[PDB]
Design an enzyme around this catalytic site. Structure first.
Site, mmCIF file in Angstrom:
data_model
loop_
_atom_site.group_PDB
_atom_site.id
_atom_site.type_symbol
_atom_site.label_atom_id
_atom_site.label_comp_id
_atom_site.label_asym_id
_atom_site.label_seq_id
_atom_site.Cartn_x
_atom_site.Cartn_y
_atom_site.Cartn_z
ATOM 1 N N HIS D 53 0.918 -1.124 0.000
ATOM 2 C CA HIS D 53 0.000 0.000 0.000
ATOM 3 C C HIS D 53 0.961 1.177 0.000
ATOM 4 C CE1 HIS D 53 -2.699 -2.813 2.242
ATOM 5 N NE2 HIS D 53 -3.592 -2.151 1.549
ATOM 6 N N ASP D 56 2.422 1.836 3.424
ATOM 7 C CA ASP D 56 3.352 0.833 3.942
ATOM 8 C C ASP D 56 4.760 1.248 3.536
ATOM 9 O OD1 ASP D 56 1.173 -0.980 4.586
ATOM 10 O OD2 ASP D 56 1.482 -2.087 2.785
#
Ligand SMILES: [Mg+2]
Ligand SMILES: [Mg+2]
Ligand SMILES: [Mg+2]
Ligand SMILES: [Mg+2]
Ligand SMILES: [O-]
Ligand SMILES: [O-]
Ligand SMILES: [O-]
Ligand SMILES: [O-]
Lengths: 386, 386, 386, 386
Positions: D53, D56
């Protein structure tokens, strides 16, 4: 209209309107609430009292003077408002040391710490006047099969409840324990997962009279069970020591919606039961205002908990008082359910030819129960269509 | 390979391989089986015995001579094969007279008939050597809230079980009762819906020692519960009097798939538990061969019930005997779960500073449980990858 | 109070009030009803029409002349009452030849028969005036994994619906098809299990425009889904050709309770949606009166279906018409959801600094959505506490 | 035993092994992992790639230069290991600005920001080599009925995915979009809740060909659905662009167990399908190591994911290759399901007397499907008892 007053015995946990909105996939949407501000806002709403976990009132790891100061300012807010503390509990699930449980952790030193943390909060709860001490073992369980031997884990759970009973008996405390069942979440499966498993467990404790259940509406609904039916069994056993009210919309994660939301017809039949059985304990709300809401929505959700109980209490009482409904109950033979089956005894039943050899099974089989008419009268009363 | 013999104690209900395939949306796909032919075919398969409901053996409404003749030819098949009858039960749910229940029907005359029908079959079951008498109340419950007052219905259910206990005590019969829990179906909700609710109920009967539970794999799974965990609680309470094995693939209608089907890892952990706890009763299969099958598929499904228990029994026993697994259990501290938390007592625990004031919570919190390694060893053993 | 009129377009299937009560664990509690008596009683109750499966009107196996007479009586009762026939369907699930399905049976000759039985009933439905023909593939599916290759069975399901499309197009008939989804029961898993799966499947057919869905309240709730949300996606797609109304209390066997029962807040949000979207098809009730009821209980349950639609219609109309609800919707920005996100395209969006570089994320994060206040107004309107 | 190689195409998200353990009732049990250490440990374990993501890889709120450095380190670790990046996604659920969603938030400015945050990550994923871009609208939905008009929110969801399509088309990018469905959690009900709903929605988009699904094992099982059946419909539609593998033990909160755990027979039938359909995309694991584990437990769980895919791959290949299984499939007429029902059209079908007039319904009704014998061979192959 339907305004709550302290006389209605409505209570709320510090952690309910105080939840910040952090969930498994997201961060807090609201700032932390001060316990003092929660006590005053709830008193203004017509609540009767508040409950707490130890770590809601006193930050984990507080020194004794920080601890002293938190309790002191909490107690002045209680006295200034006339708010009571009927119940209290321990947090044995947030801190990472409790990742395999509290009372049934595989590590023995962690089970001793969990019992020391709990006794410390029993002393404080009794000081504040709590009469019920709840144990919710959210971390007692497993995600995999060999991780927890469940017969030995039940030996550790009984050992821990027996030690707590020995402790309050020796202190001469007037306080009772109530076990809160939950099927799963946060463990894959939690031990004593429903009201019935907690009631059966209690019967094996050394002092069974000191213990009862504190059922939660949404928890029994996560196992797809009928919450009014579970509550009736608890009342039949004399074990309904407290109750947690909220809403849940089916079998999924624990939502803790405001009471009335979720399954509305089960909420109506639950209020009908509590009120006709004369339950006299607190009507406690353990719910969480959705994280979509700000602090104004938090108090609107909490005020909706109390309003929905009062509208429903009124509809159930109109239902049972309606002569037409009373007639419908006789038609469905709810009065014959109250008659003993064989008070004449087994030998008289065995000799009674009308109970078997001369019983007309097809005439009996043809009698309609008239249950759909009765349920549509219950539906009309709930909706105010009568 | 994995051939069943009578020594494995595998038993089957007459109604399982004898089910004709009629369901809620369809008619029979198979012809009726003769009880005599079922006894012989099951004996040839290596079964140890058979069970029945009264109406499986004797058509409802049979005259006493028709009744005599059915029992006589059944008993000659039993004697000719060496097959036993360990358990028997009553059908209190098929006939339309039982549409509101048997023991908790709102109609009082129907509750007396249900008790007379049950006593008649207790006499016959004891003659055939049954040691366990099962009560499955499939029709005790409700689809709507005012239809059944559940506290009075539990008074009628206790009254009926107390009358049955008085009867077998007065006859001096060596026979025990076992309650079979089910959450729903065919009623919207059934009374005593899980193992835990049946265990709690038993404690309020007049003679609790005469009663235990007969759990069914798929029934606890219809409430989404962990069947191995429910069984461990029953064994911890000394109440596992019998057990019904089958498969269920989630929360939906009751499927009664052959054992092993449905949740395969729960079947493995259930066999591991029964075998390590030394359960000595019958391994009974209450399943229904899918209606897609003919009579050859019926015996292939029934033979698959016994084969899957034996493959799984072997895999669980290799698992617990593996030194690597034994090492993994010590690593996950399953040996410390077996140690008493505070056999030193409450006063010694309260004075123990290492249990609280000097406990290093963060060191404890950092110890990994090593449960994923242990579960992958359990997975490798189940799949024969070791 | 609240009387049904023909203008309400309420209809019922012959099988709903005509259900005799047999379920998986019990025999019929009621006698079979004659279709012409069902048409008359329903017209007296204020329904607008009836529906049927071919085997509800003509007994399976009837010669052409027994067919002739059944059809003649039925059309005579319709003519006499002014009752309409809006929809019809085929029974491809009761007879044991359909034990592995109809359109997707593994046997080719069974698939061919299934299609011939269906075409025969399409010609009849068209002369009786049905404009919607329903397909409920209740037996299409499997209990085990290798028993059905689902890609090839979707090929056979597509081939069948394309052959039906070719047939109604070459006859110049004005009939449309509607698929009724169901997740399971009587098969372990049914093919096209939800509204979403049926909608996606329609898009791969030769003539997509001839086909839509017939969703049923209780079937989407057997997968725990939100029925109002599913209906909204079917209306968004222009595919809600028909709807089936009833109640269901959770994930368990298909209950078919009367409309209003089961999840009552979902029934309220469904009527609000159907009425505010101006859906104009029939409001069809596919329910089963509980087998606890006699025939008087049947008509009481069928009339409760209509009464609950009408009370809820009125509560939803009052909710939407309330000035304070309209102000609460503006406060929760329901008007802003209707404004396009970026009507000047993506290059205007990419250039806009207020959409990213200069967007104040924390001030936007802090707006409350005021959803609990809006939902409690919705709650007060349903209970008539407003 | 059974070692992963890069040729197996196994990939994992940065968030899976990097989950720190916070759940709704507890704080983190593990420290945050560095992306470059995750890439290295995963390459040593034999994985082929990683996904992420945007939040992340780059902390929410990073300046362009903090972004620069995060990205640089990560690409350096990839270059050094030969690890690929097959897919990426946007986090539109963690930050409190997304409390009512991203693409379907009621606030228009939040919808615009959501789209700008997504486009920013598409440009990055394309330079790292991702060919699939995933959308998981975890916050798109509601807990209450009037809080979201679902038809207008599907309008906004369609507008967003059409704006993304226009953008990747005008940049000439080779990326495709895949929608991940989920029925609920963290919202009470999520929009596009199953594979079927996502497939149907794709067909109303401007450019349907740019879009497919990314189904997840545990999400379809939270609605009680059959995951192999759902995957087969996605493959039949040509829309399985990616898949997410993990385990789930029933209808309850999203567990994200390691692949193989949860429903093991469904994992077997999924690998059999993916391998026999020759699906060639990544085998991505989206799971969360239990918070009971330390970092060594994390890598043990991540390696158990791959090992279970490989054991099951081998058991399924052995099942399909066994001569006796191929004979059992012919016996259950799996070959005949592949033959067209009526390849000479409907007028040849209508003329055929063997399809209706002269079809022997009772002889066809009496063929057994021999499905239990076939499923027990499948059972013997999984357990390696064959
Ligand atoms: Mg809760
Ligand atoms: Mg069963
Ligand atoms: Mg139905
Ligand atoms: Mg997940
Ligand atoms: O809770
Ligand atoms: O059963
Ligand atoms: O149905
Ligand atoms: O997930």
């Amino acid at each position: 209209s339907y305004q709550p007053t302290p006389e209605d015995r409505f209570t709320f946990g510090l952690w309910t309107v105080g939840w910040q909105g952090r969930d498994p996939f997201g961060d807090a949407t609201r700032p932390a609430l001060d316990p003092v501000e929660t006590v005053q806002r709830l008193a203004e709403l017509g609540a009767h009292g508040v409950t707490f976990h130890d770590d809601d009132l006193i930050p984990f790891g507080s020194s004794d003077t920080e601890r002293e100061s938190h309790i002191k300012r909490f107690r002045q807010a209680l006295d200034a408002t006339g708010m009571t503390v009927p119940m209290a509990t321990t947090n044995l699930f947030t801190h990472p040391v409790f990742k395999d449980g509290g009372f049934t952790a595989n590590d023995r030193d962690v089970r001793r710490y969990a019992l020391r943390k709990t006794i410390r909060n029993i002393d404080l709860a009794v000081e504040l006047g709590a009469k019920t001490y709840v144990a919710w073992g959210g971390r007692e369980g497993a995600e995999s099969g060999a991780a927890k031997d469940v017969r030995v884990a039940l030996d550790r759970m009984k050992e821990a409840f027996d030690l707590l009973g020995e402790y309050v008996t020796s202190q001469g405390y007037d306080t009772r324990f109530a076990i809160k069942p939950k099927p799963n979440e946060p463990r894959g499966d939690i031990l004593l997962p429903t009201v019935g498993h907690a009631l059966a467990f209690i019967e094996r404790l050394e002092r069974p009279e000191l213990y009862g259940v504190n059922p939660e509406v949404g928890h029994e609904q996560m196992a797809g069970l009928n919450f009014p039916h579970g509550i009736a069994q608890a009342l039949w056993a004399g074990k309904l020591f407290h109750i947690d009210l909220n809403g849940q919309s089916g079998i999924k994660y624990d939502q803790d919606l405001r009471f009335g939301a979720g399954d509305l017809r089960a909420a109506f039949w639950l209020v009908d039961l509590l009120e006709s059985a004369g339950y006299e304990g607190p009507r406690h709300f353990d719910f969480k205002p959705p994280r979509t809401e700000d602090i104004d929505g938090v108090w609107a959700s909490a005020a909706g908990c109390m309003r929905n109980y009062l509208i429903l209490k009124e509809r159930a009482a109109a239902f049972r008082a309606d002569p037409e409904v009373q007639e419908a109950l006789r038609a469905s033979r709810l009065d014959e359910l109250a008659q003993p089956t064989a008070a004449d005894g087994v030998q008289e039943l065995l000799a009674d030819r009308t109970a078997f050899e001369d019983f007309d099974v097809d005439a009996a089989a043809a009698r309609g129960m008239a249950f759909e008419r009765l349920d549509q009268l219950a539906m009309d009363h709930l909706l105010g269509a009568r």
